[PDB]
Amino acid sequence: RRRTSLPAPSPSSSNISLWNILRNNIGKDLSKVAMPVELNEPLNTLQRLCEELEYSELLDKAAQIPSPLERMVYVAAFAISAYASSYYRAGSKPFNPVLGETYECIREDKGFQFFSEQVSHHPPISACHAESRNFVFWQDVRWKNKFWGKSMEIVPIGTTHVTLPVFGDHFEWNKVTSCIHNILSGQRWIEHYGEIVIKNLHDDSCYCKVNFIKAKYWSTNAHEIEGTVFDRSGKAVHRLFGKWHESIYCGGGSSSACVWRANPMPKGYEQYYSFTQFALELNEMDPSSKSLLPPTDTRFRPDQRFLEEGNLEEAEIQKQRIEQLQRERRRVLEENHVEHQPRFFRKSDGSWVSNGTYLELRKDLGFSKLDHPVLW
Ligand SMILES: CCCCCCCC(=O)OC[C@H](COP(=O)(O)O[C@H]1[C@H](O)[C@@H](O)[C@H](OP(=O)(O)O)[C@@H](O)[C@H]1O)OC(=O)CCCCCCC
């Protein structure tokens, strides 16, 4: 049904430019350092946000569990699951979405409706919302990435929210710190360290803490997680252990059970940017839905598509042209002293949340009646 391959394979490696680019900007803000298209992968930060739903069935399961603590356990696993994918794409760069660029994924498969918009470019900020009968997932993310002499630090900012449709739950949790070791080189690998605190704003009963342990590459502790579900009193009720890229278990003492396991990677995934089966389907465009998409949707972005098709020269041409276009548009917008307003997200306190207009206007080819910004 869905594609399980790409028109052209990913290149051996073309990270020669990365050496000088990163050594010349130690300590500087990388979102301001333009980089060749050859370093990118066919997905952008909006689609990367969509991948956090690969294991969305965890929420489907928590949607019918009446105990709040078990619901907490499964949602914690879901929060950790958002990291599995990064293990194989150890060092990989997503496309930087254009201001106003949008991305959608209608999956009748997992019963969810996902959409997102790049609400800001200076600094880059991605916002997303996914709706389902069994949950509502939404978040706002921005970065503070920097390259120090031999390693890259990815610092995400913005919390993630999930709501369940029959219990009234509102889960809110923070992103953790990531490090890419040996980017310039050796064995390039990604590490995730820090503490995730998951709170249920609606249910006082419990809270959860998941620690992502940092260690030496060859250690039996690398990729480990130590989590606990605490009652209001502050007493440990359920332990969580395992490795964020293989399996997650609950229990710890008397008993134990595996609550989550990474999906097997496609046979020969190494030849396709080490994408997961899920990631392979995000940029595919299906003849019927093409008419329902808005022209700002990423599958339309020409440089990214040429990249999938293995056309490096024409991909680079399109990228620089899109950059010049974006600059001239922010130019015209600021010569009139008018701030930019995104189309599907309004700014509540500091976050970017859905303004309830995407799906509604998508109804019955409704996008065809209006007209959108031309980003390419
Ligand atoms: C990895 C986690 C994802 C975090 C990334 C999220 C933020 C992000 O896309 O910033 C991009 C940087 C490199 O910009 P790049 O792709 O050339 O995007 C261009 C630049 O932002 C450029 O300054 C801008 O010009 P303008 O300002 O004139 O408008 C253009 O509009 C953009 O096209 O890349 C990086 O952040 C470096 C990450 C390298 C990944 C690891 C490699 C192995």
Side-chain angles (χ1 to χ4, degrees), residues 18 30-35 40 45 48 91-94 96 121-122 124 143 145 152 154 180 183 188 319 323 326-327 330:
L18 205 55
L30 292 170
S31 73
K32 300 196 193 78
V33 185
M35 306 181 195
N40 284 341
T45 74
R48 273 195 168 200
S92 84
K93 183 200 184 310
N96 193 10
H121 188 54
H122 285 147
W143 306 261
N145 314 328
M152 191 151 81
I154 287 89
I180 307 177
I183 317 94
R188 166 185 316 182
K319 184 160 185 280
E323 279 147 353
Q326 174 154 269
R327 272 166 219 132
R330 202 202 49 261

Side-chain angles (χ1 to χ4, degrees), residues 22-37:
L22 296 184
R23 269 165 168 248
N24 281 326
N25 305 280
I26 294 188
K28 282 199 165 182
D29 193 341
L30 292 170
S31 73
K32 300 196 193 78
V33 185
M35 306 181 195
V37 75

Side-chain angles (χ1 to χ4, degrees), residues 45-308:
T45 74
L46 303 172
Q47 287 156 335
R48 273 195 168 200
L49 271 189
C50 181
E51 310 196 30
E52 302 189 13
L53 298 163
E54 185 181 341
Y55 304 90
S56 73
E57 48 281 8
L58 295 150
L59 306 170
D60 284 330
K61 199 195 270 212
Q64 294 87 246
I65 299 166
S67 168
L69 285 80
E70 303 202 325
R71 287 197 299 262
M72 180 74 265
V73 168
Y74 289 99
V75 165
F78 172 70
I80 298 155
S81 69
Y83 288 86
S85 173
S86 72
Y87 176 71
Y88 297 96
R89 273 180 282 164
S92 84
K93 183 200 184 310
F95 272 56
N96 193 10
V98 165
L99 187 60
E101 172 161 358
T102 56
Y103 174 71
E104 85 177 19
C105 197
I106 285 297
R107 291 291 298 244
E108 192 162 294
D109 210 18
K110 320 171 73 56
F112 72 93
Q113 283 146 328
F114 170 99
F115 61 85
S116 58
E117 187 177 21
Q118 187 76 5
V119 304
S120 166
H121 188 54
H122 285 147
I125 309 187
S126 302
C128 77
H129 192 92
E131 205 85 22
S132 180
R133 292 160 52 92
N134 292 148
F135 68 87
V136 164
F137 170 93
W138 82 91
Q139 87 183 276
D140 179 45
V141 74
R142 71 190 76 191
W143 306 261
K144 196 179 175 179
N145 314 328
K146 292 200 165 63
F147 178 71
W148 315 99
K150 282 194 174 285
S151 51
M152 191 151 81
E153 174 187 49
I154 287 89
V155 180
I157 298 144
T159 66
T160 301
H161 307 254
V162 165
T163 62
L164 303 182
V166 292
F167 299 103
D169 290 325
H170 189 161
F171 299 101
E172 165 205 286
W173 73 89
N174 66 295
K175 272 184 92 148
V176 79
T177 303
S178 313
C179 182
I180 307 177
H181 306 98
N182 311 325
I183 317 94
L184 286 190
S185 285
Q187 63 267 40
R188 166 185 316 182
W189 60 293
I190 189 166
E191 193 178 28
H192 296 290
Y193 51 104
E195 177 170 285
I196 291 173
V197 169
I198 310 166
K199 281 195 195 281
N200 179 343
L201 313 156
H202 192 190
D203 198 346
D204 214 16
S205 315
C206 61
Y207 67 91
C208 170
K209 271 177 210 148
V210 174
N211 197 25
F212 278 65
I213 295 173
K214 190 178 186 284
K216 284 194 135 301
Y217 173 68
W218 273 110
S219 161
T220 51
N221 293 315
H223 320 275
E224 277 285 305
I225 69 164
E226 300 180 349
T228 307
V229 164
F230 298 89
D231 59 20
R232 192 184 198 274
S233 155
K235 304 164 146 31
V237 182
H238 294 110
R239 264 74 58 185
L240 284 198
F241 62 93
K243 281 168 180 54
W244 57 260
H245 75 308
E246 293 168 344
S247 299
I248 294 305
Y249 312 77
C250 169
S254 53
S255 166
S256 282
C258 178
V259 305
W260 169 83
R261 75 184 168 102
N263 281 341
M265 292 285 282
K267 191 177 193 294
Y269 61 91
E270 300 178 20
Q271 84 191 289
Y272 290 133
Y273 311 94
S274 314
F275 276 1
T276 69
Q277 198 57 272
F278 197 66
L280 273 189
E281 324 173 333
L282 295 189
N283 218 41
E284 176 168 34
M285 180 170 58
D286 220 319
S288 78
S289 309
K290 178 166 209 292
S291 305
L292 277 168
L293 298 165
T296 56
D297 204 77
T298 309
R299 298 100 193 285
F300 285 141
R301 204 178 156 150
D303 56 350
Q304 185 170 317
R305 187 149 302 290
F306 268 117
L307 180 71
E308 297 193 3

